[PDB]
Each structure stands twice: as C-alpha cells, then as structure tokens.
Design a protein around this ligand. Structure first.
Ligand code: W2U
Lengths: 300, 237
C-alpha cells in the first residue's frame, strides 16, 4: 500500500481520491492519503471551497514513482510533484503516519468498484492522451478540450482521444456507403480495433478513462468520447461475443457509480435509447439495461 | 442551414445549386394476392434533380430492376438517390458542379451527406418549404418517358421550356411551383385548365403549352382559383 503525502492544505478544498472525497478546512493539519491500493491507476482531484469552477486533478500510479501534493500560491492550485530522493520521501511519510496526519484510502474489502471502473486503464495509455512527458502523472481539468473539439484552442493542453466520426471517409468505404453507415462493423473491427487500438483492451481503456474524466471533472469533451465509443460498438452488427459481454460489465459499473443528481447532464438520451432499444446490440446489454431502467427510467 | 421563405431569393443568385426530390424514386401499386394477402408491385421511378436558376432537370429514371432481390426498399431508395446524385455531380465538369444541394425531404440528408464525403465544399441543405415536386409525374411527357424505360436512363429536360427568354428565373420558378401545386391538388382540373383551348399547343420540344404572356396570366389566375377552391372543398370554407 502506497501514500501520497501533502505538504500542507492552505486553502479549503474538497479532495477526491478515486470515488471517495472528503472536505479539508483552510489550514487544517492534513498531510495526505495513505493505504492506497497498489495495482491500479488512481486519480486525486480537487474542488476549491471558494471557486467551485474548475475541478482538476491528477492521474497517477504509485508503482511509477513517489508523488506528493503541494499547494502553489502563485498559480493557485494543488500541484502534484515527484520526489526523486527516496529516503527523504520515506522519512517524510513515516513522520506523517506516526503523527496520524493522513486519511486512509477507505476501501471496503468486498468492494471491487474501482477495479471494475479501471480494469483496462493503464498509465502508459493515459500519458498518450494527456501529453506532458516530463511528468509520470497526468493533469486533467473541467475545461480541457479534445483534439476533435479543437477541429470544430491550445494544443499542448488537449485530450488526445482517438477521433471517431460516423460521417467521415475513415468510417465509410467508397462504394459501401449505405452498408457502412447503417452497420458500423467495418469501422469498429478493421479501422479502430485492428488498425488503431490493436485490441479491445486498449479500446475499453480509453472508454473507461473518458467516462472517468467526464464524471470526476465534468469534462464535456470526454463525455462526448465515452458516448461515441459506446455507440460505435452498439451500432456494429458484428462484435466479438467477449467484447459485448465485457462492455455490459463496464457500463454496468459506470452507471452504478454515477452520482444520481448528475445523470441529467452526463447521460445522452439519444445514445442510450438507441443503444438499449434500437441498435444491433439492443439485446446484448442485460446488466446495463436492467440498471438503467431501475435507476434512470426517466431518461428512457 | 435550412432553406425557407426568408432566404428564398438565394435560389436565383449565381451560385450553382440543385434541388433533389426523391418522392418518385420508389413507386408501388399495392394489391391482393391469390391467398388474400397484400403485396406490392414496383413501377418505374425517377429522381427529380432541378437547377432552379436555369430550369435544367436531370431526370434519372429508376428502373424496377434495381429493386430486385433487395430488402427495406424505402430505405434503399434514399441511398440509391444519393448514389445517383453523387454520380451526377462527379460526371459534371468542376465549373458545373453545384455549390449547394437542397433536398426536399430531410431523410435524404444523411444518405446524401455520406455519398458526397468526397465533396466537402458542397453544402447539403434541407428546406422548410412544402414544394410540389412530387407532381412531376403529372407532366405527361415526363410520365411517359419514365414508364417506357426498359433500363436505367438519364433524360435531360429544361422544365421552363423557353420561358427564360421572356421572364426571370424567380418568375419562372414561381410559375412552375404554381403549376405543380395545382396538379398535385387536383390533377384533373389542372390538366383541363392547361388544355381547354385546342388552339394552344405544346411544342414537340417543350413540356407545357405555348401560352402568350397574356394567356399565362389567365392560366396562372385559374390555377390559383383551383388551389383555393380545392382548399375549400377540402376544408369546407
Ligand atoms: C440541351 C438542354 O440542356 C440541358 C437540359 C437538362 C440538363 C442538362 C442540359 C436541354 O434542354 N436538353 N433537352
């Protein structure tokens, strides 16, 4: 189990770690988060008490370095940094643990939620969507726009998700116009899976990461990407049976984890109704359809 | 965006544009089978592609053979339309290709958009106008060439005859839409109006009779009377 220490908490802030969150008061004696489960990526995220504008945070994997959080009063946010001196870091953490100045990552033993939300997400792929190669961790916030968004303005601060566009030459073989527009299997299996993602694990990893950035930061370009990747599978007549079964699981845990009071904005009525009721895979998402109908019957 | 009353004079500016109407592409007669079920029998159809400024109508005849062994024909009809329009554009010299294509029904948008991906600079637009182009098959010479076709065929017609020698495109289009609206609302009366006078003939190379300017005014008046009449007969006013 690993630790992200905090130098201090000089401004009042709600801190998130994965699906957990807690309130820290201005200059409260808080020095970080311990007992963080090894084996998964994580995200530690922030919303200032004073300006709920800009949720921001950092994706990281404790196996890739020792990371801490330090408030920057000039740029006005909590910044993640890597400590290269290993013995310095251990001694800092040990002192904060001895003084019980750290919150414990509060995982219930029965609880596989975070695994199920990040099963296919890998730090190496995150770092290719969020390009900032001098750091082992990746910053994301509410306002960052995606490559596709910028095509329709700062490139270095973009989310480089794979562009999906159903009315594009990439998606539509010359001479197969109707066939490929009404059944997207070509685009799913040959262009995206075989060509771009190489395998369905990488496809699912980007889909999960998009969802997580949508949920945790309200990042609108990410929500667009999550729905696009779902629709591309649902609108393909020919999908590997194992991909469909796993998609149902992935979506099931995403819908389960979404805050109930955010469903109005984070969920696209057209995509879900089409996916669950009109598409080729309308009968292939039993768990997801059951939870959607019992938890958000209004949307449908 | 959408073409409507507010921007109606854009049709007659100097940017090339085509109206595309798919109403008459897939035509059927519905009938009873020996077993008392219901079956359709397709008949030949046409795509109505009109340049509104010049009157040039590219009438692509759709021969019933194109439907053989196909399913979901109403949906195929839209993609077929889009394929044939895209082929037409590609066949035109660059300086003759349209800058905009306006579809009379919104369900042509995605099919045409997808077939014209190769032409990103051609705008595909809907319209809020309820244009009467379905009535093109009430024009006897167009109906006849559609029904006689034994194979796919493109027939080339000027739908304004020689009217542009004497009137503007705006007036020519307004006459045409009034004639077609009349034929659509009461084809029998409309045709009686156009032919009542045996002395006014249709030239071999034309579609409509050779009316003088004065006679066109009488004709136009009679067609408006018809459209109000039927509007009363239909609504009891
Ligand atoms: C020759 C003249 O012009 C065209 C007419 C329609 C489309 C293209 C050309 C015509 O009325 N031929 N019948």
């Amino acid at each position: 189990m690993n630790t992200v220490p905090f130098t201090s908490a000089p401004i009042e802030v709600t801190i998130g770690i994965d699906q957990y969150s807690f309130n820290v008061k201005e200059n409260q004696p808080f020095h970080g988060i311990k007992d963080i489960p090894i084996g998964h990526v994580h995200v530690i995220h922030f919303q200032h008490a004073d300006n709920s504008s800009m949720r921001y945070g950092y994706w990281f994997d404790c196996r890739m370095g020792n990371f801490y959080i330090q408030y920057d009063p000039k740029d006005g946010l909590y910044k993640m940094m890597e400590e290269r001196d290993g013995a310095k870091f251990e001694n800092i953490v040990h002192n904060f643990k001895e003084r019980q100045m750290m919150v414990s990552y509060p995982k219930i033993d029965e609880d596989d939620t975070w695994y199920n939300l990040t099963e296919f997400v890998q730090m190496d792929k995150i770092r290719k969507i969020v390009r900032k190669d001098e750091n082992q961790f990746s910053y994301v916030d509410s306002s960052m726009t995606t490559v596709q968004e910028n095509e329709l303005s700062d490139p270095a601060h973009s989310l480089n998700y794979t562009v999906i566009n159903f009315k594009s030459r990439e998606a539509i073989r010359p001479g197969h116009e109707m066939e490929d527009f009404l059944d997207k299997s070509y685009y799913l299996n040959t262009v995206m899976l075989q060509g771009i993602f190489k395998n369905s694990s990488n496809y699912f990893g980007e889909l999960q990461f998009a969802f997580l950035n949508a949920m945790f930061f309200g990042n609108y370009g990410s929500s667009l990407q999550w729905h696009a990747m779902i629709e591309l599978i649902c609108s393909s007549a020919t999908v590997p049976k194992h991909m469909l079964d796993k998609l149902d699981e992935i979506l099931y845990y995403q819908i389960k984890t979404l805050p109930e009071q955010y469903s109005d904005i984070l969920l696209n009525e057209r995509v879900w109704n089409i996916c669950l009721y009109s598409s080729f895979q309308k009968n292939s998402l039993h768990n997801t359809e059951k939870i959607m109908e019992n938890k958000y019957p209004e949307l449908l | 965006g959408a073409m409507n009353s507010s921007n109606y004079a854009e049709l007659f500016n100097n940017d090339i544009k085509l109206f595309v109407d798919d109403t008459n592409v897939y035509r059927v007669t519905v009938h009873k089978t020996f077993e008392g079920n219901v079956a359709t029998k397709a008949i030949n159809g046409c795509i109505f592609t009109l340049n509104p400024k010049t009157g040039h109508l590219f009438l692509k005849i759709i021969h019933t053979s194109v439907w053989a062994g196909q399913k979901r024909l109403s949906q195929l009809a839209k993609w077929k339309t889009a394929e044939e329009v895209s082929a037409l554009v590609r066949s035109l010299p660059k300086e003759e290709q349209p800058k905009q294509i306006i579809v009379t029904r919104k369900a042509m948008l995605d099919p045409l958009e997808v077939h014209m991906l190769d032409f990103p600079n051609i705008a595909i637009r809907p319209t809020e106008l309820r244009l009467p182009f379905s009535a093109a098959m009430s024009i006897d010479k167009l109906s006849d060439v559609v029904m006689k076709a034994t194979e796919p065929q493109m027939v080339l017609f000027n739908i304004y005859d020689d009217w542009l020698d004497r009137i503007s495109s705006y007036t020519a289009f307004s006459r045409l839409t009034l004639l077609l609206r009349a034929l659509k609302t009461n084809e029998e009366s409309a045709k009686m109006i156009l032919l009542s006078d045996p002395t006014i003939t249709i030239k071999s190379y034309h579609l409509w009779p050779s009316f003088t300017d004065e006679q066109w005014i009488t004709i136009e008046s009679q067609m408006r009377d018809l459209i109000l009449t039927e509007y009363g007969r239909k609504y009891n006013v």
